Each structure stands twice: as structure tokens, then as C-alpha cells.
Design a binder for this molecule. Sequence first.
Ligand SMILES: Nc1ncnc2c1ncn2[C@@H]1O[C@H](COP(=O)(O)OP(=O)(O)O)[C@@H](O)[C@H]1O
Lengths: 306, 914
Amino acid sequence: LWEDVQRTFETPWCRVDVLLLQSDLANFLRRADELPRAVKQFEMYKSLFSQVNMLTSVNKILVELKDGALKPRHWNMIFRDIGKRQIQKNLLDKLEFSLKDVMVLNLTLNEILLTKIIERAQKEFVIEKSLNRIKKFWKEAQYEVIEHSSGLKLVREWDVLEQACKEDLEELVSMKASNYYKIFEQDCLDLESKLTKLSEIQVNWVEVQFYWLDLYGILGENLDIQNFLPLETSKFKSLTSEYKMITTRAFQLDTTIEVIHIPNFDTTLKLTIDSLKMIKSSLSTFLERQRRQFPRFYFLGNDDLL
Amino acid sequence: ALHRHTNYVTTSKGLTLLPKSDIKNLVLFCDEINLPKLDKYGSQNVVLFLRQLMEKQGFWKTPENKWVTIERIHIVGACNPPTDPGRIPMSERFTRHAAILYLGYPSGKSLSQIYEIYYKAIFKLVPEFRSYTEPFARASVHLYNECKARYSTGLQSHYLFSPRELTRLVRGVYTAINTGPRQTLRSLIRLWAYEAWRIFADRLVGVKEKNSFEQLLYETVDKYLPNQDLGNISSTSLLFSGLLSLDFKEVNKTDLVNFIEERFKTFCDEELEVPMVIHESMVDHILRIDRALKQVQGHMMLIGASRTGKTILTRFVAWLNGLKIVQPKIHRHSNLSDFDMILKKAISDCSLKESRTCLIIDESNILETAFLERMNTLLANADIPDLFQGEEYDKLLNNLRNKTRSLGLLLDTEQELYDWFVGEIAKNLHVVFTICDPTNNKSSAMISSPALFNRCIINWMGDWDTKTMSQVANNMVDVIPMEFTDFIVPEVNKELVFTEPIQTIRDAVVNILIHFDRNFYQKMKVGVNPRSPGYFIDGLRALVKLVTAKYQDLQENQRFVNVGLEKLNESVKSLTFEKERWLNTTKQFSKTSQELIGNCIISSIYETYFGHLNERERADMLVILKRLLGKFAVKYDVNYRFIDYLVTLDEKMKWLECGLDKNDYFLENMSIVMNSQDAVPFLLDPSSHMITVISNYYGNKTVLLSFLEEGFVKRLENAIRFGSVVIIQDGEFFDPIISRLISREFNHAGNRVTVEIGDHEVDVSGDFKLFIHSCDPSGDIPIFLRSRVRLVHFVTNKESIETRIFDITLTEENAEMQRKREDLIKLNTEYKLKLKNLEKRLLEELNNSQGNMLENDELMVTLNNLKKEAMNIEKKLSESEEFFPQFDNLVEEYSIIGKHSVKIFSMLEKFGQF
Ligand SMILES: Nc1ncnc2c1ncn2[C@@H]1O[C@H](COP(=O)(O)OP(=O)(O)O)[C@@H](O)[C@H]1O
């Protein structure tokens, strides 16, 4: 029994399970008495029973420190302020310390400071859970692609991701109010920066795609209108070519967020939307110039007049 | 409804028919055929559809526009007489095609035989009293007759009796005899009386009609069952329950109460935590709800008042019987599809898994009439055909076919499977409606609905009576110490006392609280009181916390004065013998400790009740409370001011700096808002000037939301998780998802507190505050919100003129008197602070002057100094002793001025309203 209990004391804390620990402690209690008096008189049985009673004395503490909220920083703080010793970093960062250390911390007496540090652990995990959820959502998000008559690729359902980005940005802003935000600041700031860049790119992209669809009906299809406005359609063809290259390289990434790393993307979309707006203004001026020559065209509109 | 039994077919000359699915003819029983409402142009379309089905023998498909000829389907409708309330007259174009048959009540004498047969049936379990089959039945019938004549619809709209009540009584008598112990004649009479109480007298309103029913029961028993060994047949005198024993026997009250308490403690511990007090009415209603939930189609409708305990009592009784409590998590933007999905999930759990759910439907858990119609269809039948139709039906029949196989019973026919499904829903699903005020349109529609009123057991909780309030108060004022007031038993009328005869200060406290609650509801509320005490409970809790805090303060002050006196006795200079005189405050402590309970009662009542009152209503009710304290033998500070007593100088200066006005009314309102944070505050003000003020109090932590914006549900879930003060700009609207936040009903854990919003569990930081804010005082708030929230009125009413002109008149009529008025209290307060400051200065100097001699000069000069403020304090007290009588004498003249001023302003505002 001594070998078994010594083995179970040496298991790494990252692999200890309390459900089997309860049964193992029950077996240890059952088999403590059946040992002969030779073991009883020696320190072996006394030490074994004392350690088993130490394990059985505290069981809420073990399950509380088994929670996912505990982190290597909290273990370091517990060891330094309660155990008065330093743990090897390889032994600590992987939570592979043995149960003998947990015995050493003397959970029976220091349980007040233990719960004091665990409360901080759960609140820091409240912050970390939101950060991890945001990161996981934005590591798997992707647009929905369709292809119209031309070779261009079109995005559908802008809202399902725009609203998610806006809500995540609001969440990252609201995290600064929490007192336990200081340790998570260095990651939240970078995530907020990336999401702000993605939001700006999204804002430009939706307008670019909408304006290109609106203008493709007018120019690029009807040869007559392009003949009346050669400069506008000449610019529009180059805009469509550049937008096609940009969108192909963008959806060759499989993730929406990584477009922030594309060289010259946001400025390219700004230039594209500016040129599309100038072409739209040119169409408006041309239509008004046509209407001021035969004013009855004011009873028709734009599509009929075109 | 027809989709289950009919099968569309097609033929060249037979363009789609809708005949029977089987070979038997089909009979459509449309109950309450004249009930459906009619359009604004005066035509109800369902009746016209029925006429189309009976005259043209067909109809038109609305998607496809094809003539569907019904084949061998018959129409049989049932309707109450059109003179009954809510019965819309039917057009003669429809009833022209139907043969009308009138079916009256079975003559009142045939009922005797009809139910004597039932009693002969149910006495096969108890043959020893076979000869008693005939009496009981007659008695039952007689009882019904009397309850039909005494309690008419003229008293209450839900006093509708019928032989269905007699059948319920017979089933109850059987199901108590069947599972009960060996019976005796007295036991059978008491069992029948208990069932009669539960059937006929549960719905009764007011103690007058309950006493009338009790004397009717006594007369019936003495007339038809002239037994000579019986006890009291009152509702609380007899208690039948199977919670204690394995039988169903009349249990002793003390054992029942002890068991209920030891189970309620466990329920509050392991289930959601709400500190609650057990009393006799709670035990009685627990028995009632247990009896309702125990039977097969046991549905209950609890009509009481808000904060009575109906919802948590239902949850507790369901937990006792192992019923899964399901509550619709709906909110403002929840449409009929969400309710349909919730009902579908509840039904699937009830039948496909045998979950034995208990669906608690609040009055506010229904938004439009579609929800109520779904409840009608679920209750009248044991299923809602609209949920399971078309392809969803095909899945259901599949899930049935597998499931029914797992129980070891073979059923391959679709009809058999659906009949088993209906039976499982009927014996597994219990619906417990809870409605706060029955005069509301939604709740009146719920009560008057035929399916609910005919299937549900109307249990009328009503509002708390004086006995329940006394019990709750006694169990709630028994935690705070009252061994310092030196109470003397006062001479009061027997009607004034409510608890056991007054022998200690605690009984006086509970009597004062009950009397003030009654007087307050008598003045504010008119007619019937559909409001249950939530002010009373909040006031009790506030009084507990305030007595604790004030006694701690008094202990600290007494300790400081005593240690100073010991130091001065220890200090052995020439002038410290006179500080022995100025430390006569040990005598003042004896007087100020006697008034601690009175001041705490006044302050707690002011915090709870007067949040939503005018400047004059507050004064009148405070006068009433003072005369109530004087009626009993509890003392209080004669010159008591709420601002001075509760809020300190630092907090008042902070509020004034943040942007609060200089009004005493606004200072009291802010004290109510800030000091009382056991319940959410609901600030009502037309101008939004408070929204900035609160923000100025909390700097950058303030977060502004509203119930109208779409992302609100998410935004709060952020503010609730990271600890930022939340102000919700609108309060007249309210989506019940914040319900679990309005009442502090959380899910605790190891060290994380979690609250359910919608269907997400969010962790509360602990630094998170919630203020609800409203703009228009005309707007209403849901009864769930209004009774849970601390409503604070920040409006500037007309009565604000009444005082304000005074502050002008006295400014330009008695300038010196006005000057002395403010500086009297100002110097008084700054004296109470600075004399303590100088006393601790003197004490620490004595600490630093243990054995020195040159340092004693500063001690002597400050000793001579303190005499000056002592003289100023004494002079101010002596001058106030004459100033206050003159001030109160001078108040009444300008009160006469203000009486006309307020009327003039009201006339002006009516002019402006025109
Ligand atoms: N016996 C009691 N002791 C203490 N508080 C009670 C008692 N009965 C009711 N209450 C108060 O009334 C409220 C009733 O809660 P609940 O039943 O959920 O709402 P409702 O009564 O409106 O259905 C509780 O919050 C509780 O504070």
C-alpha cells in the first residue's frame, strides 16, 4: 500500500482527477487498518494515515483549485505567499507539480487566503473567457462568396460579421472598466487595434461593393452609354480590374480578419470608392445636362432616360 | 385541427376534397361557437367559415385558390346563451343552417341521484358507511345550490358555479379516500368538508364571503349529516396532506409547519436563494398547490397581489413533488414564434421523455392575444395542433413510434400513438398561471377565458391580512437587539393590537408597522387593495439594517466618550476638572439611546414608503407615523429631520457638487436613492437633470443604456460582467429579461455569483450598480417592476411652490429671523462635528503629554478654547428653545398665503393645459 500511496502522491497536478481521488482515498482508508502491527509500530503506517487524513480533511479546496480559472501566475503567488518557496518554472507553467506540494501548502489553515486568491482567479478568468471567445470567433470568421455574370466575386451577408465586429469592439472597450484589466491590457489592446482596422476595412468594403454593383448596371454593359462617356468607362474598367485582383487576393486567405495584413488594402479601397463616387457624379452631371436640353426628360427618371 | 383527421384528395370532377382519414364520419365539435370576437365592421370570420362549410359544403384554399369540397364532415357547435358576458351574438345567416337544442341544468333534484351514484361508487372502498351514500350526495348538491345563489356574478366576475364543481368534489373525495387511511365517519365528514373548501371556497374574495361559506358548511353538515363529534371546519383548522405520511390524512399543524420549515430551508439553500419567512397562510397555500399538482390535469390559477409569494411558492411546491419548473424566458421583442418554440420544447420534454414539467405562466409572460389562444388550446385539449402540423407532424409521429416502443407497449396506428401522446401530456404537464391584479385587461381576459376558467383551479391568494403581516414581522424583527429602549407596556384598545398582547417593544414595533401600512394604503390606494405588502417587507428589512447601523454608531460614540473620561480621570490639569464637567455626555447617551428605535422606524418608513410622494403627502404621513409612535410607548427624537439623521455632511456636499438642487425634497430623494441599495432605484423626473448627476457621482464608470436600442441586451451583459454603473434612460418600458436582476435572485457558486439574463448566465462583478430612469410620470410600469423597485420621484410638483414662497416671504418680511433660521442648524451641525474634533485633539495631546511640562501650555490654551464652543452650543440651544416655537407660529400665516398661491397656480396650469 505504501508504494501505491507514494505513486499517487507524485502524480502531476495537471493530471489529478478528484473523482478517482475520492475512490482512491476510500481504498486507502479501507486498507490502512489491515496492515500488520509491524507496519503500525513503525512510522510508515502513522505517516500514511496522517497523509490520507490530510487529503480527506480538505476536498472542497482540491476541486476549487481544480477549476479552469487557476493559472500558473496564481500557483506562483500561492507558493510564494503560503508555501514560502519558489517552484521551477517548467514544473509550474505546465501545472505538473505533485500532490505533495498541495499537501505542503496546508490547505486546512491557509484556506482564507486561498479563497482570497481564488476569487481573483475567477474574476481574471471572467476577463480571459471573453478575450478567448472573441479571439476564437475572429479566427474562424469568413465571408460568404457568390459570383455574378462577371468574373468578380461578391460578398453576401455583411451584417452577420459587421455587427459581430461592432459588438466585439464595444466589449473590448467595456473591459477597461474592470479592475482586473491591467494584466490583460497588453493583449486586449492589440486585439482592439486589429478589430478597429478590420472595421475600417469593412466600412470601406461594403460601400465599394455596393457602388460597383450600382455602376455595373449603367457602365460596362451597354456599349452606347460607354460610347457617350468614354473616360468614365475607361476608368471603370481599370477600377474593376484592380478590385478583382484585390478581392481574389483577399479571399485567398480563408479568414476575414487577415485582410488587415494585406499590403495596401484599406487605402486601395478608399481610392476605389473615391473613383467610383467621381464616376457617379459624372453620370449625374451627364444626366442633368441631357435633361436640360429636352426638359420633358424630367418626367422619366434615370433608368428610363438611360 | 382538422389536419390530423382529414386527408386531402383530388379528382377530375372532384377537385380537392377534404374527407375523413378513416372510414368513419367526422364530427367537428366547435365549443364556445359564439365566443370569437368580431371585426371592427361587425363580422366574425370563423362563424362565416363555419357557414361556408355547412351551406356551400366547401371552402377555398388560401395559398392555391381551389374549391375544396368537404365530404361527410358534420358540424356540431356548443355555445352559452348570448346574454352571458363576452358572448358575441351570432348572425342569423349562420344559425339558419343549424338545429338549435337547449340543454338546461338537470333540475337540481336529478343532481341528487346523479351524484348519489358516484358516492355509491366511491364508497366501495369504505363499505362500513354504505348507508351514508345518500346523505353525502344530497349535502353536496345542497352545498352547490347554496353556492350558486349566495355568490353570484354581481359580487365577482369569476363566481361561476356548475355541476362541474360537484364532479370535481366527487373526484377529490374519492382520491382522498383511495389513498387515505382507514376512515371513520368524523374523518369522512372532515374530508368532504376539506374538498368542499378547496372546490367552492378557494376562489372566494374577502373574509366576509369566506365566513359566509364556513357557516353554510356548518349548516349543511348539521342539516344532512347530524354527527356529534366534529372539530372546527375553518380553512386553517383542518389540513389534509400527504407530505408527511405515506397516506392522505389530516395532519397536526405543528408537525406540518416544522416539516415545511425544514424543507423550505433546504429549498432556499440548494435552489435559488430568497430569504423567506414561513407562516400559516403559506402552509395552507402550499397544501392547496400540492393538491392541485398531485392530480392528473392539475392546473392552477393563482390570483393574489404582487410580492405575496405565489411564484416562489409554486416553485417550492414543484420542487417538493419533483416537478421540473419551466418559466417562459420572454422579453419585449419576443414574438409568437418564440412562445411556440418554448411550448414545443415543454411538450417534447413532457411526453417524449416523461419530465413532469410545471409551466409557470405569469400575467406579463403573455404579450398579445395569440399567447392566450395558445394557452386556451393547450388547456382545453391536451395538445396544441398548430405546433405539430404538416412535416413537423411527420417527425412527431416518428419520435412517438420509437418512444412508445421503448416502454414495452405496442402501438402502430397513428391514432393510438397520438392518443398516448395526449394522455402523457395530460398526466405530465401542469400549468400554473400567476396574475397580480385581476382588474387589469390582460388578467381579466385570462380569467374570463373559457378553457382556463374551466380547467384551472382558481386559488385566490389575495393580499396579506393582519395575522400574516404580524407573523412575518415578528419573525423579522426578532433579529435586532431591543434591550436598551426600556419599554413599558402601554394601554391600547384591543382593536389596535394585532399580534399577541403587547408585552415587549417588539410587539409595539410590529403593531406600528402594520398600522402605518394600513393607513398608508387607506390614504393612497382607494377602494379595493390589489396591492400586497412589498413596502412592509422592504421597510422591515430597512429597519433591521438601520437599527444595526445606528446601534453600532452609538456603541462607538459611547466607547469614545468613556475612553476620554478615563483619560481625563487618568490625567492628574487645573482646567481638565472642567472637562470632567463637559463630559456629561454620558448622561445624554441615556436619552439618545431610548429614541434610537423610534428614529430608526421613522427613517426606514421614510426610505421605503415616501419615495414616490409629494412634499405635502410626506409631511402628512410623517405626522401620522409620529402619532402612531405616540399611540404606543415608543419614543423618538421630537425635532427629527431625515436629512440630518441619515446623510452626513460629506455626502451632502458631494451631491451638491455633482449637480443636485438645493431643495430639501431633492436632498431627501437623493438620500433615498443612495442610502437604500438593497433594491434597484427607479428615478422618475421629467427633466433628465438627474442622469448627469448620477454620472457626475460615478465619473467615468457610468454607462447609459435604454430599453429601446437593439444592442441593449448585449451591452448590459458587458456592464454586468466588468462592473460599471448602469443608468437605463427609459423605465416605462421593461423587458422581463432584466427580471432576474430586478430581484436579487442569483446563482451562487464557490466564489462566483452568476445571474441568468435571457438564456445566458453572466457573472456579476460586484461593483455593478443599476439605476432605472424614466422621463414621463404619466407612463406606467409593469406591476412586476413597480413593486420590486425603489420608486423615487424627482418631479417639481405644485406643492414645491407651497414651501418655496415661504422661503421668499420670510426672506423679505423677517430678514433677521430668516438669517438665524439657517445658521442655527448650520452652526449646530458644525458644532457636533468640531467639538468631537477638538475632543480627539485633546485626547491625542494628553497622549503626547504623558510626563512633560513645557508642552502643557498648548493643552491649557486649547482647554480654555473648548469653553468657547461649549458656551456657543449652550447659547444656541437656549435660543432655539424660543426660536422654534416662534418659527412654528410664523409658519401658519405664510401657509395661509401658500394655500391660495397653490390654487392660483393650479388654475394657471389648467389654463395652460387648455
Ligand atoms: N413569507 C415571506 N417572508 C419574507 N418575504 C416574503 C414572504 N412572502 C413573500 N415575500 C417577498 O415577496 C416576494 C415574492 O416573490 P415571488 O413569489 O417570486 O414574486 P410574486 O410574489 O410577485 O410572484 C419575494 O421577493 C419576497 O421578498
